Amino acid sequence: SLLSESELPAGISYAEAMEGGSRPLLHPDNPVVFFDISIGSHEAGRIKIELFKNLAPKSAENFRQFCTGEFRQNQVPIGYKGATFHRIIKNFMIQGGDFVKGDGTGRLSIYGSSFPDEAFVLPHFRSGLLSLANSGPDTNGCQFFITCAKCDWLNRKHVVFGQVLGKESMQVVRKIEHVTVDGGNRPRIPVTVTQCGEL
Amino acid sequence: XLLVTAGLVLA
């Protein structure tokens, strides 16, 4: 299923994504969501994200509901509002979305405790892609990462299911990427999704 | 190494 770079669909090059606004580029029915990020107490800006429903519908919908507050447990919404980025590796990726525990151990999806890997269509071919964190095959939950470089060694083990849109989005990713971290790559100052939703 | 796992980060 994995596409080579020469066979990638229109709308997902870095240049194309950086020209993006608030509407999807890969397929017209893909949802666009956002995170407003705080670094410590300071507003860092907005990351807009196209979710590739056309290629990874389950993964896209899971992320979308966690952005909008539509997923509940016994009538209590849970999702990315207030979630942190707990693992940041310069020149590699930024990882977050553990709203369960805030430390990387958390796993919950809108489908249950976990959900299987969808088809591995897209490669980790550049910075600015959204991909699922996991604990091996068929263990997707709530965590994700945004690539800060090509990382094709992750291909066929993590589903690439979205892309950040526009220059501000990437600027925010770069800001997060370069914060000071401890020896375990945890930020010294918290990085939080203070608001999120659908555009 | 350079992985993205959820619980025990490996090399």
Numbering used by the authors:
A (entry chain A): 13 to 211
B (entry chain C): 1 to 11
Mind quoting what the paper says about this structure?
pmcCyclophilins (Cyps) are ubiquitous and evolutionarily well-conserved proteins first recognized as specific cellular receptors for the immunosuppressant cyclosporin A (CsA). These proteins are endowed with peptidyl-prolyl isomerase (PPIAse) activity to catalyze trans-to-cis isomerization of peptide bonds at proline residues, which is a critical step for correct protein folding. Herein, we characterize the functional and structural properties of a conserved (TgCyp23) and a more divergent (TgCyp18.4) cyclophilin isoform from T. gondii. While TgCyp23 is a highly active cis–trans-prolyl isomerase (PPIase) and binds CsA with nanomolar affinity, TgCyp18.4 shows low PPIase activity and is significantly less sensitive to CsA inhibition.
There are two monomers in the asymmetric unit with an almost identical structure (RMSD of 0.109 Å for the Cα superposition). As observed, the Cyp folding is preserved, with main differences in TgCyp23 related to the 40 extra residues in the N-terminal region. Stabilization of CsA is performed mainly by polar interactions and van der Waals forces. Trp165 residue, located in a 310-helix in the Lβ6β7 loop, is crucial in CsA stabilization due to the formation of a hydrogen bond between its NE1 and the carbonyl O atom of MLE-2 in CsA. Gln107 plays a very important role in the CsA packaging since it both establishes a H-bond interaction with CsA and acts as a bridging residue in a H-bond network that stabilizes the proper orientation of nearby residues Arg99 and Gln155. Both the hydrophobic pocket (Ile101, Phe104, Met105, Ala145, Phe157, Leu166) and the catalytic arginine (Arg99) are conserved as well as residues in the H-bond network, providing a substrate-binding site with similar shape and dimensions.
